[PDB]
Amino acid sequence: RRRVIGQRKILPDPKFGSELLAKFVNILMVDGKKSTAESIVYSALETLAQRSGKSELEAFEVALENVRPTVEVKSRRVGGSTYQVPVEVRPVRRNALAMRWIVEAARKRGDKSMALRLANELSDAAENKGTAVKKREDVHRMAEANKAFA
Amino acid sequence: RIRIRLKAFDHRLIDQATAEIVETAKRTGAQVRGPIPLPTRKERFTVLISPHVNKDARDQYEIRTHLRLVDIVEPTEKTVDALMRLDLAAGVDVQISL
Amino acid sequence: AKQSMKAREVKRVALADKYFAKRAELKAIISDVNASDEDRWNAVLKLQTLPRDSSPSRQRNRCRQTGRPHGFLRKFGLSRIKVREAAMRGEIPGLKKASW
Amino acid sequence: GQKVHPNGIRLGIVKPWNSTWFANTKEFADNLDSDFKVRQYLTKELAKASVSRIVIERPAKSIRVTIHTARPGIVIGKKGEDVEKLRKVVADIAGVPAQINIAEVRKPELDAKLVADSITSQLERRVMFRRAMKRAVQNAMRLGAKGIKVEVSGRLGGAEIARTEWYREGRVPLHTLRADIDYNTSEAHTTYGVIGVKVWIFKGEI
Amino acid sequence: RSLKKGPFIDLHLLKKVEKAVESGDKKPLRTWSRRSTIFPNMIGLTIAVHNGRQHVPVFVTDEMVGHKLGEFAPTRTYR
RNA sequence: GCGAAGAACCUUACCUGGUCUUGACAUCCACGGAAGUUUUCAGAGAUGAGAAUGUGCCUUCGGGAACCGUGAGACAGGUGCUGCAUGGCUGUCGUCAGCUCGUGUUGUGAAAUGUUGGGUUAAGUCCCGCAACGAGCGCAACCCUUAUCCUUUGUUGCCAGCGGUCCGGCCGGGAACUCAAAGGAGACUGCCAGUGAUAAACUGGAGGAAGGUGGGGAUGACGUCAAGUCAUCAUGGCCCUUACGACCAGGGCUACACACGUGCUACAAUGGCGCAUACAAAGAGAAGCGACCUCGCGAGAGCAAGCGGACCUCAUAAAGUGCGUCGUAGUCCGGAUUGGAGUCUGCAACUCGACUCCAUGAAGUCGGAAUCGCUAGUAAUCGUGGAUCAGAAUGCCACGGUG
RNA sequence: ACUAUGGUUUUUAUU
């Protein structure tokens, strides 16, 4: 209804130097075990450099650019509303969704060794085949085949 | 030394029982340990608030017991013989030892 | 519970010296298996289970206000509805509404 | 909704009680059993004796009961000996010797229990109950009340009816931070039915 | 098996049986308790245990090492 | 996860077979025995007998209490019913914003207005404007809890400042700040601006630890379902009375061919476990709370200190912290179960038991219509007791760490 | 206004 709660933010952590590295105590953190996620922060990115070593200025230049959100879909009910309404996402989502919105196999058959897992997800977001492709690339055709209203 | 125990449920009655053995002593220049109320005992109860059918709605009640020892170094017939005869104050338990 | 059951309430404690005091030294050894032979005292073996209904095996401290054996506050001897009934009169000394 | 006794928190302001005694936690259940038993026996012996409240003390191996009445003569009897029967009949019902004291009450038509007694006696004289209620309201206010309610339910006026009826003036708040209310509920025990009577009185000065 | 980790006999029933072996033979001794445990004096004895309506015959042989009399007369119909 | 916190019997209804009928709970009259101790036979037992034996307390010598026995009337008894018959209680909507009155007004009156309208909200609120003006209950503040500070105080706990010193709160003594006691300050759109009907609102700025019921408590106005309920009581009428009352023994209520809620455990691999480590609270407690010790594979059986409560048993909170190890496999997973051998209570554990050690091991990989909690110390995850008390719950109430 | 559509529930103590 009338809720207008202040927006959450995170500060860059001086041990890792950036805001993009400051969220790996939450992204792939479980059961409230926050220091158990701290155990593998930034050393997972050195393990990513074991699979493609190109330094920190290129560490996320496709591993986020290939997978970031661009559109928000679903309908809006205004009479005969059997269509979808596409809108372009705001810059506050530029680093979001792509490391949270799919667990379809990770909670079903696991997702390989945990200390190697972020080095696998940052490599799989740069390999872009099989898993997590349909949920991303379906809105690159839906927004061209169902766009006659807004 | 002669030793006494003053025990009650009411926080002003416990001090009325204190006044007949501590003010009566200070008003004769008798030596005293000074105002020490001691830590308080309490116990809690949860009681069902309907008389009939409803088993989920309930309310809470407290019983609190105050225990003072007062300390005596100059005992008198106006204190250690008088607190065992106290009729003007109801709901207090006095116990004494030689 | 009935007044006829309130007379049974006292008949159930009437055997305390008649069966439950003169063989209490036997009652401490009567089922111990660290003993010689397989039978040694059959003429006294049954005397403390020979009494029925009025036994410690049926003794219960009970609600002192309804005769019910279950669902009552052992600190007051009575049930929730009779604590409630007295609290509406402020009638129980030192007992006051609070949840801390 | 439960509407359940919001006035019970108002004795936290330090007050003297109608059962005023101490006990070990292991003996409290037997003290509460004897506290019930003497109250019952004495309120059956004093059932029509203009009593406003019964008060219980427990001195060392003794029990001391104070009877608050608007009519001391019906309690004491000729030569003052009828209260020595009232003692003797309960002298072992609680396992301790019983002491019986009498206290006089002024302004009887101002006490919520003795206003219910004025309604039970007018129902016993079988007079028009609505008149007895509107009398009870005005009599209490003129005698020292600041607010009052009188309520009755079932068999109204000795008739083949259910229903409820009430009259009120000057507010009877039970839930507010201060009012020091006087409250009572009784039964009139008529030849047509029990007829439940409820009374609440406000006097102020708190 | 039986009582207090060893053999057990109710001597009142043992004597009730001693007064019944003169009567049967082909009139088996009726008993109404099912809480009773077998004892070796039941060898060659004719007895019948209650099932809440009638009595069902019981026979004890030396290969019986311990049973309750309710085992020899089932009650509930199942299906 | 029903009334109903625990099952051989019992609280207990139901059924069969025994036993009684003014009964028997209990009161007035009557009236013989002490209660008991030893002990045998019948009956499923209640009961009914056979053989020994005590003579207490009280004792105006008349006559009583304890514990039993037995007789007469007035009687009653009820482990019955009726809420479609009642005072009430609780459930619903719902903490929804509403139900109602005095006087004025409208209407022929039943009824309405006030309580609507226009701003604005959690709100019959808070305002503006009116044929209304005020008011009781509900709403709301006051009230309870707390953020940051202030203020008082104490033991066998705390110890700064002042002093002494087994150099130690050890001790004179005192509360730095903790802990427990608690109590107070502070919040009023007040204050600066905007928007508006320069009214109330609602958003920014300021002072603040916190601001616009801060978030949580406390609670539940009228009133319906002929709601359930006479098993919480209370009650009028009605019913049973060789019994539907009272007393007894054993059955039964736990009978089982499928249907559904209420849950609970797993559906593994930031899962499982070995070894080493820390901090929360909150409760129980002298036929009780329980350490030590031995015997044993263990349940347990003996032996048994300390504790009388902020002082002493239950008692080294778990995850997280650190060092290591699985073998990729419906898994060392998962638990329904078939076996072997024990511990103990109890009138007795077959029917109908809790716990202990060791062989065996299925279904199960997040689930369909549909119905669901949640706006952050909350999703997730891992920890602590007590009521009941031979045996018994996943419910209840009390409590925390990480997020 | 802001999708074109979706039928049945025995007479009954009776307030």
CSV table of C-alpha atoms in Angstrom, one decimal, chain C:
chain,number,residue,atom,x,y,z
C,1,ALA,CA,-16.1,-35.7,40.6
C,2,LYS,CA,-19.0,-37.1,42.9
C,3,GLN,CA,-19.2,-36.8,46.7
C,4,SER,CA,-19.3,-40.7,46.7
C,5,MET,CA,-15.9,-40.5,44.9
C,6,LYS,CA,-14.8,-37.9,47.6
C,7,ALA,CA,-15.5,-40.7,50.2
C,8,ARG,CA,-13.3,-43.0,48.0
C,9,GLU,CA,-10.7,-40.1,48.1
C,10,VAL,CA,-10.2,-40.9,51.9
C,11,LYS,CA,-10.7,-44.8,51.7
C,12,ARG,CA,-7.7,-44.9,49.3
C,13,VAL,CA,-5.3,-43.5,52.1
C,14,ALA,CA,-6.8,-45.7,54.9
C,15,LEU,CA,-4.4,-48.7,54.6
C,16,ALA,CA,-1.1,-46.7,55.3
C,17,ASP,CA,-0.3,-48.6,58.6
C,18,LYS,CA,-2.4,-51.8,57.7
C,19,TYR,CA,-0.5,-52.8,54.5
C,20,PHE,CA,2.0,-50.0,53.7
C,21,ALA,CA,4.2,-49.7,56.9
C,22,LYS,CA,4.8,-53.3,58.5
C,23,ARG,CA,6.5,-54.8,55.3
C,24,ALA,CA,8.4,-51.8,53.9
C,25,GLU,CA,11.7,-53.6,54.6
C,26,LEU,CA,10.5,-56.5,52.4
C,27,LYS,CA,9.2,-53.9,49.8
C,28,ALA,CA,12.9,-52.8,49.2
C,29,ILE,CA,14.1,-56.4,48.2
C,30,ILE,CA,10.9,-58.3,47.0
C,31,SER,CA,11.9,-57.9,43.3
C,32,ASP,CA,15.7,-57.7,43.5
C,33,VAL,CA,17.3,-60.4,41.2
C,34,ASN,CA,20.6,-60.5,43.2
C,35,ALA,CA,19.4,-63.3,45.5
C,36,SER,CA,19.6,-67.1,46.0
C,37,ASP,CA,17.0,-69.6,44.7
C,38,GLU,CA,14.0,-68.9,42.4
C,39,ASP,CA,11.5,-68.8,45.3
C,40,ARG,CA,12.1,-68.0,49.0
C,41,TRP,CA,9.1,-65.9,50.5
C,42,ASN,CA,5.9,-66.9,48.6
C,43,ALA,CA,3.8,-66.7,51.8
C,44,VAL,CA,4.4,-62.8,52.0
C,45,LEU,CA,5.2,-62.2,48.2
C,46,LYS,CA,1.6,-61.0,47.4
C,47,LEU,CA,0.6,-59.1,50.7
C,48,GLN,CA,1.5,-55.6,49.3
C,49,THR,CA,-0.4,-56.2,45.9
C,50,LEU,CA,-3.3,-58.1,47.6
C,51,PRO,CA,-5.0,-54.7,48.4
C,52,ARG,CA,-6.7,-53.2,45.3
C,53,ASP,CA,-7.9,-49.7,44.3
C,54,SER,CA,-6.6,-48.3,47.7
C,55,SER,CA,-2.9,-48.8,46.7
C,56,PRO,CA,0.0,-46.2,46.3
C,57,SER,CA,-0.2,-47.5,42.6
C,58,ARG,CA,-3.6,-45.5,42.4
C,59,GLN,CA,-2.6,-42.6,44.7
C,60,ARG,CA,-2.7,-39.1,43.1
C,61,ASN,CA,-2.5,-35.7,44.8
C,62,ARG,CA,-5.6,-34.5,42.8
C,63,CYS,CA,-7.4,-31.1,42.3
C,64,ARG,CA,-8.5,-30.1,45.9
C,65,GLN,CA,-11.5,-28.2,44.2
C,66,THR,CA,-12.9,-30.8,41.7
C,67,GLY,CA,-11.5,-34.3,42.5
C,68,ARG,CA,-9.9,-34.4,39.0
C,69,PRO,CA,-6.5,-36.2,38.9
C,70,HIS,CA,-5.2,-34.2,35.8
C,71,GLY,CA,-4.8,-30.7,34.4
C,72,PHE,CA,-4.4,-28.6,37.6
C,73,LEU,CA,-1.8,-26.2,39.2
C,74,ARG,CA,0.1,-28.2,41.9
C,75,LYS,CA,1.3,-24.8,43.5
C,76,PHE,CA,-2.4,-23.9,44.2
C,77,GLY,CA,-4.0,-27.5,44.3
C,78,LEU,CA,-6.7,-26.3,41.8
C,79,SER,CA,-7.4,-25.7,38.0
C,80,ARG,CA,-7.0,-22.7,35.7
C,81,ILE,CA,-10.7,-21.7,35.9
C,82,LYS,CA,-10.5,-21.3,39.8
C,83,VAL,CA,-7.2,-19.3,39.6
C,84,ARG,CA,-9.0,-17.0,37.1
C,85,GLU,CA,-12.1,-16.8,39.3
C,86,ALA,CA,-10.0,-15.7,42.3
C,87,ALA,CA,-7.8,-13.3,40.3
C,88,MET,CA,-11.0,-11.4,39.2
C,89,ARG,CA,-11.7,-10.7,42.9
C,90,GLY,CA,-8.0,-9.9,43.6
C,91,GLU,CA,-8.3,-12.6,46.3
C,92,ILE,CA,-4.9,-14.5,46.1
C,93,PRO,CA,-2.2,-12.7,48.3
C,94,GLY,CA,0.8,-11.3,46.4
C,95,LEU,CA,-0.6,-12.5,43.0
C,96,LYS,CA,-0.8,-9.6,40.4
C,97,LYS,CA,-1.3,-9.2,36.6
C,98,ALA,CA,2.1,-8.9,34.8
C,99,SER,CA,4.1,-10.6,32.0
C,100,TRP,CA,7.6,-9.0,32.5
